[PDB]
Design a protein around this nucleic acid. Structure first.
Ligand SMILES: [Zn+2]
Ligand SMILES: [Zn+2]
Lengths: 136, 141, 320
RNA sequence: CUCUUAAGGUAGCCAAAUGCCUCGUCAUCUAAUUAGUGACGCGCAUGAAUGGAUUAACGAGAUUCCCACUGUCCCUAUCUA
RNA sequence: GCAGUCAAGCGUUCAUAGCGACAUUGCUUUUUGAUUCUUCGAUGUCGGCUCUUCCUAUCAUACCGAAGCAGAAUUCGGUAAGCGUUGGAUUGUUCACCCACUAAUAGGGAACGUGAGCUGGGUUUAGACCGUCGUGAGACAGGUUAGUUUUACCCUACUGAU
């Protein structure tokens, strides 16, 4: 899981499994990302792996800028719609699931992340913090 | 109005770029992880070559499907992209196949560059075993 | 400049062994010459041709058995396929020569451009005949020793054979990969006609930034799909495209200067297959390598018409 | 020139519900396709009222993909007779 | 299929840090074959889903040892079966093949585990089409499409309860 990640994240509720088509939040030219796998996910029989906020996934672009699609690229989940619990008691959820295309080191490919970004995603990667306007 | 940051000297543009052209030429590789020499089998009677799991493809020398079987040989050429693998002449006797390959590898950030690199395909002598057992008198159908 | 293989002499004597040996070896020297030519022009652009022994042997056999050739090239691009070393190769017996080249599929050229093409076809003194299979001509008719019918494929050269005799001698196809292992025709029995297989000639320009996806490359078997896409895009403007197809494609959604006017074919193939309903496996996206084949095999037929000017760089000869 | 007692697969069509080899070859769709489609054809063993090719409309016919939708599934839980 | 036995040579003159000759001894039933011994007054016939247990011939994890082991990464071997050993595209598939994550995606057995547990895609009746064969009825271990999956309330076993 620690592929360029800064620290260790708490267990956010697993919002979106494989096959989930989340939006694309940065100006990379992509528009949606089709999650095929999650980095650092445990293997149980029939349990298909799920990605929470701030997770690094392997995904595929399904729409926009044909230089980008038909290849597997790492993404980082910056918004989810499953309500998760922060340890200071608040439950919260966004209105859409949205990720950001990055390299395997964690450095982004775009230049600006439109829309809010969860604190648990912005803290774990110093490059997603540098490119996000609204945090939570 | 920048500097290379690897060697330091040349001012490069604002078109979207990286360190200098000699620096990406000598330091940065996008063609790593390939063997520049490769062996392939053959038969002198039926003139049939193969990838070692699979059936013979029934092509001849200086063909088009030689590009297909050499791409289907496991190199790094499949994932690094591909364009213009056109054939280069070799002496028929010298028993070599020379293919130039041009991949468009991705740099440190978003900048796609051209590449010229070469791999030699040397052919060894075989006898097509599945043909040798056909002459051998085992059970009939 | 140097594009043909050359067989000097027969010498009539004996010894088929060395008659095969001198022809094989001779053929190989031409391959070495072509590789030297290849280092020269940058490193990448290679002329389209073939370099096997047998299908060139099948021309080496028939050139002197006919001792005159006639040509079948398409009228939509006739400047490029006049190979330099073939009218020069009907020269080497010092007999009746000067092949009298013919250009076919010439129905597609009107009166305002057949005469403009005849200006080029006369002024630089090149042999020329106009036929929909010296200035006082409009087009020859189907009314108007061995004849060598020479042509690279899909020019309708087997549809020419079904328009002078009515015999149906060789089999034409849609893909250009059929004509091989020649078939002579006996008609008007004092005269003979021989056949030539499909031989593309080496032309030293426009090979990878090409325009040769009109008669050469397999349209059903391609793996670049954006070159011919933009090639179909930049000519045949948007109004004629929507006139033929009826589909609404664009009113310049992206306003930046990457496209402007005369739209490129990354919003054309998606706009064609969003109407033809061709979708991918996993998301609803109009697949451009599925739309590109039905665009290319509709353009190279003659429906989406385009002809280049006589070889001077002009603005626009066709007017839809 | 012929060889069997007649003729020697014509126009078309195709790994087709007909192709053994065979998961045929090339391209394409997919991150990945023994599937699907297009193309090729010496086709074990296609073919012209033992009817061939193409076809709008129609089908509780067979097949592939997409959009929408969902407990089919991740991953089960609860309620009613 | 695996284990040892002498190991020509190769591995930079380095017979063994590993691999490879000729021939050679031998094992396990987890497979190809050979008989016909058991069932012909029927032991429900492939695969998948589900679930339990066992073996070691160890893929990962634990601890060691040895290398052309400087570190890093590898290789090989010893104890070791405690604990794990996946998500998908195509195919009925076992098998295979890619994609991807992972510490790792090891090999097997229990009537080739398991149909009064399920499913019925395949095979394997009757309908029909093609191709080849046959004069013909018809054949094909060839292709294709449709095609009823029954009973526990008894004894034991197990799970709980008097
Ligand atoms: Zn520099
Ligand atoms: Zn062979």
């Amino acid at each position: 899981s620690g592929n360029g990640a800064q620290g260790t994240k708490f267990r956010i509720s697993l919002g979106l499994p494989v096959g989930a088509i989340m939006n694309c939040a940065d100006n990379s030219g992509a528009r949606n990302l089709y999650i095929i796998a999650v980095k650092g996910s445990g293997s149980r029989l029939n349990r298909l792996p799920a990605a929470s906020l701030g997770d690094m996934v392997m995904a595929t672009v399904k729409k926009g800028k044909p230089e980008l699609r038909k290849k597997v690229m790492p993404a980082i989940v910056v918004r989810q719609a499953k309500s998760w619990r922060r340890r200071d008691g608040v439950f919260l959820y966004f209105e859409d699931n949205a990720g950001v295309i990055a390299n395997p080191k964690g450095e982004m490919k775009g230049s600006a992340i439109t829309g809010p970004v969860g604190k648990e995603c912005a803290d774990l990667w110093p490059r997603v913090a540098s490119n996000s306007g609204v945090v939570v | 109005t920048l500097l290379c940051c690897n060697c330091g000297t040349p001012i490069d543009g604002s078109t979207g770029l990286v360190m200098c052209y000699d620096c990406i030429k000598l330091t940065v590789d996008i063609t790593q992880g390939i063997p520049r020499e490769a062996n392939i089998s053959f038969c002198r009677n039926c003139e049939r070559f193969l990838q070692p799991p699979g059936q013979w493809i029934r092509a001849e020398l200086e063909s088009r499907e030689l590009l297909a079987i050499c791409l289907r040989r496991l190199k790094g050429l499949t994932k690094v992209r591909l364009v213009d693998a056109s054939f280069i002449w070799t002496e028929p006797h010298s028993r070599r196949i020379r293919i130039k390959l041009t991949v468009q590898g991705e740099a440190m950030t978003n900048t796609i560059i051209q590449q010229t690199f070469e791999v030699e395909y040397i052919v060894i002598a075989m006898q097509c075993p599945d043909c040798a057992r056909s002459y051998t008198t085992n059970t009939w159908r | 400049d140097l594009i043909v293989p050359r067989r000097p002499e027969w010498n009539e004597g004996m010894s088929k062994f060395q008659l095969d040996r001198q022809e094989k070896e001779a053929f190989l020297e031409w391959r070495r010459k072509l590789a030297h030519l290849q280092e020269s022009n940058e490193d990448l652009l290679l002329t389209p041709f073939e370099r096997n022994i047998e299908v060139w042997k099948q021309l080496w056999r028939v050139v002197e058995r006919s001792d005159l050739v006639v040509q079948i090239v398409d009228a939509r691009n006739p400047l490029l396929f006049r190979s330099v070393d073939l009218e020069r190769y009907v020269k080497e017996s010092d007999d009746r020569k000067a092949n009298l080249l013919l250009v076919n599929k010439a129905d597609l050229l009107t009166k305002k451009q057949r005469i403009a093409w005849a200006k080029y076809f006369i002024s630089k003194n090149i042999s020329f005949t106009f036929y929909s299979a010296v200035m006082e001509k409009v087009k020859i008719l189907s009314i108007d020793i061995n004849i060598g019918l020479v042509g690279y494929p899909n020019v309708g050269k087997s549809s020419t054979i079904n328009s002078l005799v009515g015999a149906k001698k060789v089999s034409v196809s849609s893909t250009p990969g059929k004509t091989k292992h020649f078939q002579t025709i006996k008609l008007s029995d004092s005269v003979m006609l021989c056949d030539c297989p499909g031989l593309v000639f080496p032309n030293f320009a426009y090979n990878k930034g090409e325009l040769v996806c009109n008669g050469v490359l397999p349209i059903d078997q391609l793996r670049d799909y954006i070159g011919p896409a933009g090639l179909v895009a930049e000519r045949i403007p948007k109004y004629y495209i929507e006139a033929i197809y009826g589909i609404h494609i664009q009113t310049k959604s992206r306003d930046e200067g990457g496209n402007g006017d005369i739209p490129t074919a990354q919003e054309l193939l998606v706009a064609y297959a969003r109407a033809r309903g061709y979708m991918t496996q996993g998301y609803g996206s109009a697949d451009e390598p599925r739309a590109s084949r039905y665009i290319l095999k509709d353009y190279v037929n003659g429906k989406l018409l385009y002809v280049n000017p006589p070889p001077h760089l002009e603005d626009d000869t066709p007017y839809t």
